Design a protein around this ligand. Sequence first.
Ligand SMILES: O=C(Nc1cccc(C(=O)Nc2ccc(S(=O)(=O)O)c3cc(S(=O)(=O)O)cc(S(=O)(=O)O)c23)c1)Nc1cccc(C(=O)Nc2ccc(S(=O)(=O)O)c3cc(S(=O)(=O)O)cc(S(=O)(=O)O)c23)c1
Ligand SMILES: [Zn+2]
Ligand SMILES: [Zn+2]
Lengths: 77, 78
Amino acid sequence: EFVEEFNRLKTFANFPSGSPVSASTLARAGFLYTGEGDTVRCFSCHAAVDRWQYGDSAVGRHRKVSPNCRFINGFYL
Amino acid sequence: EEFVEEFNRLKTFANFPSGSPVSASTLARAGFLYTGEGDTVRCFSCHAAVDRWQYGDSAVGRHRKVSPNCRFINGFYL
Ligand SMILES: O=C(Nc1cccc(C(=O)Nc2ccc(S(=O)(=O)O)c3cc(S(=O)(=O)O)cc(S(=O)(=O)O)c23)c1)Nc1cccc(C(=O)Nc2ccc(S(=O)(=O)O)c3cc(S(=O)(=O)O)cc(S(=O)(=O)O)c23)c1
Ligand SMILES: [Zn+2]
Ligand SMILES: [Zn+2]
Protein backbone atom coordinates (compact mmCIF):
# COMPACT_ATOMS: atom_id res chain seq x y z
CA GLU A 1 0.00 0.00 0.00
CA PHE A 2 2.52 2.61 1.19
CA VAL A 3 5.16 -0.09 0.44
CA GLU A 4 5.35 1.63 -2.95
CA GLU A 5 7.66 4.63 -2.82
CA PHE A 6 5.41 6.42 -5.34
CA ASN A 7 2.39 6.27 -3.04
CA ARG A 8 4.37 7.71 -0.16
CA LEU A 9 5.59 10.51 -2.40
CA LYS A 10 1.88 11.28 -3.15
CA THR A 11 1.41 12.30 0.53
CA PHE A 12 3.93 15.19 -0.04
CA ALA A 13 1.32 17.55 -1.43
CA ASN A 14 1.74 20.96 0.33
CA PHE A 15 5.08 19.97 1.82
CA PRO A 16 7.20 23.15 2.13
CA SER A 17 9.34 23.87 -0.94
CA GLY A 18 11.70 25.68 1.46
CA SER A 19 12.88 22.44 3.14
CA PRO A 20 16.61 21.56 2.81
CA VAL A 21 15.67 17.87 2.29
CA SER A 22 13.45 17.13 -0.69
CA ALA A 23 10.20 15.18 -0.54
CA SER A 24 11.77 12.63 -2.90
CA THR A 25 14.64 11.76 -0.55
CA LEU A 26 12.24 11.55 2.34
CA ALA A 27 9.78 9.26 0.58
CA ARG A 28 12.64 6.96 -0.46
CA ALA A 29 13.61 6.85 3.24
CA GLY A 30 10.20 5.37 4.05
CA PHE A 31 8.45 8.62 5.13
CA LEU A 32 4.96 10.05 4.50
CA TYR A 33 4.26 13.75 4.98
CA THR A 34 2.04 14.50 8.01
CA GLY A 35 0.67 17.78 6.57
CA GLU A 36 2.22 19.77 9.44
CA GLY A 37 5.52 21.64 9.05
CA ASP A 38 8.34 19.33 8.05
CA THR A 39 7.28 16.49 10.32
CA VAL A 40 7.37 13.20 8.48
CA ARG A 41 6.27 9.78 9.66
CA CYS A 42 7.52 6.34 8.56
CA PHE A 43 4.78 4.16 7.04
CA SER A 44 6.19 1.04 8.71
CA CYS A 45 7.50 1.96 12.15
CA HIS A 46 5.04 4.92 12.57
CA ALA A 47 7.79 6.94 14.25
CA ALA A 48 8.20 10.61 13.28
CA VAL A 49 11.12 12.98 12.55
CA ASP A 50 11.08 16.77 12.18
CA ARG A 51 13.39 19.83 11.94
CA TRP A 52 15.38 19.04 8.82
CA GLN A 53 18.60 20.93 8.15
CA TYR A 54 21.01 21.08 5.24
CA GLY A 55 23.07 17.89 5.22
CA ASP A 56 20.69 15.57 7.08
CA SER A 57 20.51 11.96 5.82
CA ALA A 58 16.83 10.96 5.89
CA VAL A 59 17.88 7.29 6.18
CA GLY A 60 20.39 8.12 8.91
CA ARG A 61 17.93 10.05 11.06
CA HIS A 62 15.39 7.21 10.51
CA ARG A 63 17.81 4.56 11.71
CA LYS A 64 18.59 6.79 14.72
CA VAL A 65 14.95 7.02 15.89
CA SER A 66 13.95 3.41 14.94
CA PRO A 67 17.02 1.15 14.57
CA ASN A 68 14.69 -1.85 14.57
CA CYS A 69 12.30 -0.53 11.90
CA ARG A 70 11.35 -3.20 9.35
CA PHE A 71 11.67 -0.77 6.45
CA ILE A 72 15.12 0.37 7.46
CA ASN A 73 16.24 -3.22 8.08
CA GLY A 74 15.14 -4.18 4.56
CA PHE A 75 12.02 -6.29 5.24
CA TYR A 76 10.12 -4.95 2.18
CA LEU A 77 12.88 -5.06 -0.48
CA GLU B 1 10.30 -1.03 32.97
CA GLU B 2 12.01 0.89 35.84
CA PHE B 3 11.75 4.21 33.95
CA VAL B 4 8.15 4.82 35.06
CA GLU B 5 9.38 6.95 37.96
CA GLU B 6 10.30 10.49 36.88
CA PHE B 7 13.38 10.49 39.25
CA ASN B 8 14.86 7.45 37.49
CA ARG B 9 14.51 9.24 34.13
CA LEU B 10 16.04 12.33 35.69
CA LYS B 11 19.11 10.25 36.64
CA THR B 12 19.90 9.62 32.94
CA PHE B 13 20.58 13.37 32.36
CA ALA B 14 24.19 13.43 33.49
CA ASN B 15 26.23 15.48 31.01
CA PHE B 16 23.14 17.01 29.42
CA PRO B 17 24.10 20.32 27.74
CA SER B 18 23.98 23.14 30.33
CA GLY B 19 23.00 25.48 27.49
CA SER B 20 19.85 23.59 26.49
CA PRO B 21 16.75 25.68 25.69
CA VAL B 22 14.72 22.94 27.47
CA SER B 23 15.89 21.69 30.89
CA ALA B 24 16.50 18.05 31.91
CA SER B 25 13.67 18.17 34.48
CA THR B 26 11.22 19.41 31.80
CA LEU B 27 12.31 16.57 29.50
CA ALA B 28 12.17 13.84 32.24
CA ARG B 29 8.72 15.09 33.26
CA ALA B 30 7.67 14.64 29.60
CA GLY B 31 8.64 10.95 29.62
CA PHE B 32 12.14 11.25 28.17
CA LEU B 33 15.49 9.70 28.95
CA TYR B 34 18.79 11.21 27.80
CA THR B 35 20.56 8.90 25.30
CA GLY B 36 23.95 10.39 26.17
CA GLU B 37 24.46 11.96 22.74
CA GLY B 38 24.04 15.66 21.93
CA ASP B 39 20.67 16.84 23.19
CA THR B 40 18.94 13.70 21.89
CA VAL B 41 16.34 12.19 24.22
CA ARG B 42 14.16 9.08 23.91
CA CYS B 43 10.75 8.20 25.42
CA PHE B 44 10.97 5.06 27.56
CA SER B 45 7.49 3.96 26.33
CA CYS B 46 7.19 4.76 22.62
CA HIS B 47 10.92 4.96 21.71
CA ALA B 48 10.60 8.33 19.95
CA ALA B 49 13.91 10.16 19.69
CA VAL B 50 13.83 13.92 19.77
CA ASP B 51 16.57 16.47 19.60
CA ARG B 52 17.45 20.00 18.37
CA TRP B 53 15.50 21.72 21.11
CA GLN B 54 14.70 25.47 20.70
CA TYR B 55 13.30 28.31 22.87
CA GLY B 56 9.52 28.09 22.59
CA ASP B 57 9.41 24.24 22.43
CA SER B 58 6.95 22.38 24.67
CA ALA B 59 8.59 19.08 25.64
CA VAL B 60 5.15 17.45 25.95
CA GLY B 61 3.78 19.13 22.83
CA ARG B 62 6.64 17.90 20.64
CA HIS B 63 6.40 14.46 22.29
CA ARG B 64 2.68 14.22 21.37
CA LYS B 65 3.31 15.37 17.79
CA VAL B 66 5.92 12.70 17.10
CA SER B 67 3.96 9.98 18.96
CA PRO B 68 0.24 10.94 19.41
CA ASN B 69 -0.54 7.33 20.49
CA CYS B 70 2.28 7.06 23.04
CA ARG B 71 1.02 5.14 26.11
CA PHE B 72 2.77 7.48 28.54
CA ILE B 73 1.32 10.61 26.97
CA ASN B 74 -2.18 9.09 27.04
CA GLY B 75 -1.94 8.24 30.72
CA PHE B 76 -1.51 4.40 30.47
CA TYR B 77 0.74 4.62 33.58
CA LEU B 78 -2.02 5.73 35.97
O1 LIG C 1 7.37 2.11 18.53
C1 LIG C 1 7.18 2.59 17.42
N1 LIG C 1 6.28 3.60 17.13
C2 LIG C 1 5.31 4.12 17.94
C3 LIG C 1 5.16 3.89 19.32
C4 LIG C 1 4.10 4.46 20.03
C5 LIG C 1 3.16 5.27 19.37
C6 LIG C 1 3.26 5.52 18.00
C7 LIG C 1 2.33 6.34 17.30
O2 LIG C 1 1.99 7.44 17.74
N2 LIG C 1 1.77 5.73 16.23
C8 LIG C 1 1.05 6.34 15.28
C9 LIG C 1 1.14 7.71 15.09
C10 LIG C 1 0.49 8.32 14.05
C11 LIG C 1 -0.22 7.57 13.14
S1 LIG C 1 -1.07 8.39 11.84
O3 LIG C 1 -1.18 9.88 12.13
O4 LIG C 1 -2.49 7.85 11.83
O5 LIG C 1 -0.39 8.15 10.50
C12 LIG C 1 -0.31 6.19 13.29
C13 LIG C 1 -1.04 5.47 12.35
C14 LIG C 1 -1.14 4.10 12.45
S2 LIG C 1 -2.02 3.19 11.27
O6 LIG C 1 -1.60 1.72 11.32
O7 LIG C 1 -1.59 3.72 9.92
O8 LIG C 1 -3.52 3.36 11.48
C15 LIG C 1 -0.51 3.44 13.47
C16 LIG C 1 0.24 4.14 14.41
S3 LIG C 1 0.85 3.13 15.62
O9 LIG C 1 2.39 3.15 15.81
O10 LIG C 1 0.34 1.73 15.31
O11 LIG C 1 0.14 3.59 16.89
C17 LIG C 1 0.35 5.54 14.35
C18 LIG C 1 4.35 4.95 17.32
N3 LIG C 1 7.94 2.22 16.36
C19 LIG C 1 8.92 1.31 16.32
C20 LIG C 1 8.71 0.22 15.46
C21 LIG C 1 9.69 -0.75 15.28
C22 LIG C 1 10.92 -0.61 15.94
C23 LIG C 1 11.18 0.47 16.79
C24 LIG C 1 12.42 0.60 17.46
O12 LIG C 1 13.51 0.62 16.87
N4 LIG C 1 12.33 0.61 18.79
C25 LIG C 1 13.38 0.88 19.58
C26 LIG C 1 14.24 1.94 19.28
C27 LIG C 1 15.29 2.29 20.12
C28 LIG C 1 15.46 1.62 21.31
S4 LIG C 1 16.84 2.04 22.39
O13 LIG C 1 16.38 2.61 23.74
O14 LIG C 1 17.55 0.73 22.60
O15 LIG C 1 17.82 2.96 21.65
C29 LIG C 1 14.59 0.58 21.64
C30 LIG C 1 14.77 -0.09 22.84
C31 LIG C 1 13.93 -1.12 23.19
S5 LIG C 1 14.14 -1.93 24.66
O16 LIG C 1 15.58 -2.47 24.70
O17 LIG C 1 13.10 -3.04 24.76
O18 LIG C 1 13.84 -0.92 25.76
C32 LIG C 1 12.89 -1.49 22.38
C33 LIG C 1 12.64 -0.86 21.18
S6 LIG C 1 11.30 -1.60 20.25
O19 LIG C 1 10.15 -0.71 19.79
O20 LIG C 1 12.03 -2.13 19.02
O21 LIG C 1 10.74 -2.81 20.97
C34 LIG C 1 13.52 0.19 20.78
C35 LIG C 1 10.16 1.45 16.96
ZN1 LIG D 1 10.52 3.28 10.08
ZN1 LIG E 1 6.41 8.47 24.20
